[PDB]
């Protein structure tokens, strides 16, 4: 009667975990073999990906329990460490610094400080007096001070910092994540994808698209855009300690600059190792800042309020400053060129939206620009101290960088007094939320090509 039969190559799958690998987009790496993300070691994706939509397939999704984002976080940490490993270590520079003054008066921000010390030459006996201009957030007054002019570095009582090599470029080259053979990556195709829940349109692929590992807090930069509508993603939307990833549809352009003409000098420390620092500032001293259009940012906040009032019905939402904390927590972190900006964002997230469409200024046109000021550090302790601290070497000349804004990382500070006005503050710092906004579509599965079924057919014996 009915005899059991086995089929090889059935199209079924199951949920599993595996070690995906990088694959670049065959960019010209004949001279740029010095990138920090080592993308020249990735497999060149010469052909187009196997983009096939399945049809009549439903799959359940949950990206907060994804393992791809944890793997990508560990890859970024290990790439950073193995790029920062063979460079110069700044252990002989942690000495007593005599810092008088560098800027002539208060100026814009007098964050320069003229610190001199006794560096060590190639000869272990002769020590030489040297000077350099350090930024104000890098130097601390020395312990047991009688308001004296003795300063040390921020990192000396915590961990020694290795500087970045000057040939290493921090440019975010796109990275494709590819599953091994025998696995697959299934992605959603709903244009109004919640983030969790099932999808009615699923396609298959072997390699994800070219996501840019862009490191920034608060505002997201250079990301992928949503298709037609602003998408608001969160784990619960009722727990106040869950970061809301807002995904815009139209990008907003930001222009960030450090305008003062800075120089670079090399201080020899030990045999064969140098140390690059700020030598002098040529010309006038101006303020490092960033510029956004005010009308476009108001329209973007108004549309985010439109999309957010339907999840908090019959309420007014009200944007505010970031919470209490240090500069590295509150300020919008940023990096272009190689200089690590930290921008203020207190006049940016400022206003409110109730149910009525308050401003119809999109019908008119204005050239008013919001300008937010940014400080600049050298010594960074990023990813909460799980990675090593780095001294970013200075860059001669002025720096400019155009960028887009595709996402926001908000948080809620509701309470009993928030019965009509709802507070939404900027927040960030958990760096895997940056890469949850790019790996929202994808899921990894393992194919199981053995199948068991009866055919009412017997083996010929």
């Amino acid at each position: 009667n009915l005899w059991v039969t086995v089929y090889y190559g059935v199209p079924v799958w199951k949920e599993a975990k595996t070690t995906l690998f990088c694959a670049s987009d065959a960019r010209a790496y004949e001279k740029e073999v010095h990138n920090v993300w080592a993308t020249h070691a990735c497999v060149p994706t010469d052909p187009s990906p196997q983009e096939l939509v399945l049809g009549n397939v439903t799959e359940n999704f949950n990206m907060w329990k994804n393992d791809m984002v944890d793997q990508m976080h560990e890859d970024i940490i290990s790439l950073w460490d193995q790029s920062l490993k063979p460079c110069v270590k700044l252990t002989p520079l942690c000495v007593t610094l005599i810092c008088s003054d560098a800027t002539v008066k208060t100026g814009t921000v007098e964050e320069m400080k003229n610190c001199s010390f006794n560096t060590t030459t190639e000869i272990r006996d002769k020590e030489k007096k040297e000077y350099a201009l350090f930024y104000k957030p890098d130097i601390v007054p020395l312990s047991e001070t009688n308001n004296t002019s003795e300063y040390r570095l921020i990192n000396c009582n915590t961990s020694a910092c290795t500087q970045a090599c000057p040939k290493v470029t921090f440019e975010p080259i796109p990275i494709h994540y590819c599953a091994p053979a025998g696995y697959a990556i299934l992605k959603c195709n709903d244009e109004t994808f919640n983030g969790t829940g099932p999808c009615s349109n699923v396609s298959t692929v072997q390699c994800t698209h070219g996501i840019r590992p862009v490191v920034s807090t608060q505002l997201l930069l250079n990301g992928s855009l949503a298709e037609k509508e602003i998408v608001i993603r969160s784990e619960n939307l009722t727990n106040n300690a869950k970061i809301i990833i807002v995904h815009l549809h139209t990008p907003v352009e930001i222009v960030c600059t450090r305008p003062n003409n800075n120089t670079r000098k090399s201080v020899r420390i030990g045999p064969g190792q140098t140390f690059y620092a700020t030598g002098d500032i040529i010309g006038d001293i101006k303020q490092a800042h960033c510029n956004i259009s005010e009308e476009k940012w108001n329209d973007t906040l108004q549309k985010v309020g439109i999309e957010l009032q339907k999840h908090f019905p019959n309420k007014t939402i009200k944007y505010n400053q970031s919470a209490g904390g240090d500069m590295e927590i509150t300020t919008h972190s940023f990096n272009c060129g190689g200089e690590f900006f930290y921008c203020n964002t207190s006049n940016l997230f400022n206003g409110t939206y109730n149910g009525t469409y308050i401003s119809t200024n999109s019908s008119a046109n204005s050239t008013s620009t919001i300008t937010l000021q940014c400080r600049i550090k050298q010594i960074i302790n990023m990813w909460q101290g799980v990675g090593r601290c780095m001294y970013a070497p200075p860059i001669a000349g002025n720096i400019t960088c155009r960028s887009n804004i595709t996402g926001l990382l908000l948080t809620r500070d509701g309470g009993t007094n928030s019965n009509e006005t709802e507070t939404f503050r900027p927040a960030g710092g958990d760096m895997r939320d940056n890469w949850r906004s790019e790996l929202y579509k994808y899921k990894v599965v393992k194919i199981e090509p053995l199948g068991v079924a009866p055919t009412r057919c017997k083996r010929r014996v």
Binding site: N1, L2, W3, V4, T5, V6, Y7, Y8, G9, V10, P11, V12, W13, T18, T19, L20, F21, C22, A38, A41, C42, V43, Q50, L52, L54, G55, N56, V57, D75, S78, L79, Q82, C178, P180, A181, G182, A184, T204, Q206, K446, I447, E448, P449, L450, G451, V452, A453, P454, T455, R456, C457, K458, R459, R460, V461
Partner: protein, 122 residues
């Protein structure tokens, strides 16, 4: 690849060979590349070893001389092969698997020893 994931079982009777042709072809990144290269070989060889133990290796569709139990049977042939998809089948059949696999293995060895005894008695 996986073009008939939502189709019927019989519609997978012509596209089951394209799911079998993509199963092998595809220093941090060096480590990940090496581990992926070993994982693909392991996942191919496990399925080939199970097919060889059942004895119907070298072909895609088999017949295994073992009756289908009524505890596993719930539908008719048209209902299974014309309405349900392979993923729903794999969801609803997945229990009682290792006893089926052992039954196929001992049936294959019984066939081998019976054929060898028949040729030795020739």
């Amino acid at each position: 690849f996986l073009g008939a994931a939502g189709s019927t079982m019989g519609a997978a009777s012509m596209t089951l060979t394209v799911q079998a042709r993509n199963l092998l072809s595809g220093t941090v990144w060096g480590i990940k590349q090496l581990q992926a290269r070993v994982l693909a070989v392991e996942r191919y060889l496990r399925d080939q070893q199970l097919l060889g133990i059942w004895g119907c290796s070298g072909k895609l569709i088999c017949c295994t001389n073992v009756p289908w139990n009524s505890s596993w049977s719930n539908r008719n042939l048209s209902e299974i092969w014309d309405n349900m998809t392979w993923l729903q089948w794999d969801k609803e059949i997945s229990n009682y698997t290792q006893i089926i696999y052992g039954l196929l293995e001992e049936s294959q060895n019984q066939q081998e020893k019976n054929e060898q005894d028949l040729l030795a008695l020739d």
